[PDB]
Ligand binder design. Sequence first.
Ligand SMILES: Nc1ncnc2c1ncn2[C@@H]1O[C@H](COP(=O)(O)OP(=O)(O)OP(=O)(O)O)[C@@H](O)[C@H]1O
Ligand SMILES: [Mg+2]
Lengths: 357, 21
Amino acid sequence: TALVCDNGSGLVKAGFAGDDAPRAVFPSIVGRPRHQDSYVGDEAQSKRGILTLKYPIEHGIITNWDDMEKIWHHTFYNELRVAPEEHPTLLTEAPLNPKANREKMTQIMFETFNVPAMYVAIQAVLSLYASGRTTGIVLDSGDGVTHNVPIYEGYALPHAIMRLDLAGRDLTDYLMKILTERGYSFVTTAEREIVRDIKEKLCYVALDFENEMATAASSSSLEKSYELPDGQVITIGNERFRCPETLFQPSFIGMESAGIHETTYNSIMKCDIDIRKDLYANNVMSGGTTMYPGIADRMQKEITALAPSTMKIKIIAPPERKYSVWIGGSILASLSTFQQMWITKQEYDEAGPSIVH
Amino acid sequence: PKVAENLKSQLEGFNQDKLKK
Ligand SMILES: Nc1ncnc2c1ncn2[C@@H]1O[C@H](COP(=O)(O)OP(=O)(O)OP(=O)(O)O)[C@@H](O)[C@H]1O
Ligand SMILES: [Mg+2]
């Protein structure tokens, strides 16, 4: 069985090709002791107070290879419990990943881990695959990074890719700002954890942000309560939707960027005119920070306001969307048609890391 | 020159059901 490892900004999703879900999901982090000897994922939480905690793909591009190899070694030996030499491994990459980067990934797999074969796929591309389409425009918001990726006949159009350096860690931080400004105590990593859960449980995307601010101002009907373990109930009403409102208004955390509805629209307007009609009717959302209730509906209404009046627009938001990158990999990795596309160890010895292009 | 259509067809047509649980 082939392996599928999605190298996410905050979490690794990995498992086997042919499966409907990943087997292992864990923070994309390496911890080394200071004293005196390596832990990854859940464990670099599970022994956190004696380590230096590294984040080798904070931002989505892999920044340190040592720590990255560590993440892979953990993923192969602890988490999937596999011999990497027995399995094809499909690896994911961020949109706009530097070629020296993709070659490096390839070098590590073959050289270090000794895989019989491998392949690098773009994350957003896989998510579009998971939604059974080969043309569409993907919004992928995950932990550390958001992109808009328009895709034609199976191939990202890298010149139209848009990037927003704001994603769900930035939203947790902001809920954390909000709540701490209200008098509450959230600093510790046991306490970010709480803020995250509050965000993941209660936050939603307003259909109309001012229409929603006024409902919160006039009745108590949007006020929800959350019990910290220390007994404290924290009541929130407008914060629920101010937090994810930042994807659309990046000014909320002091950023000068276009919001996601806008980057979606600019990205379409950088593609071929003759394929715009099909991006518009095939906007797919993916990644954990797309999970807010109302985001598809808001995205519909905003694009509508931007597009020409006659344009058929469709937003698609799979309930799997936290994991469609990975599912897309699992699908593609398992298809008969894909099997002549794997980069084989023979192919690597003969062509070098350059082959992966 | 030949590297899409059969792959295209399995992807679009793939039954997400047929996936191990
Ligand atoms: N129901 C939810 N509501 C809001 N946000 C959520 C929900 N579930 C998960 N998230 C957020 O999604 C973020 C991670 O999503 P995801 O797995 O897509 O990111 P990532 O893949 O690690 O980043 P990258 O795209 O580089 O891989 C988490 O920080 C989490 O807080
Ligand atoms: Mg991701």
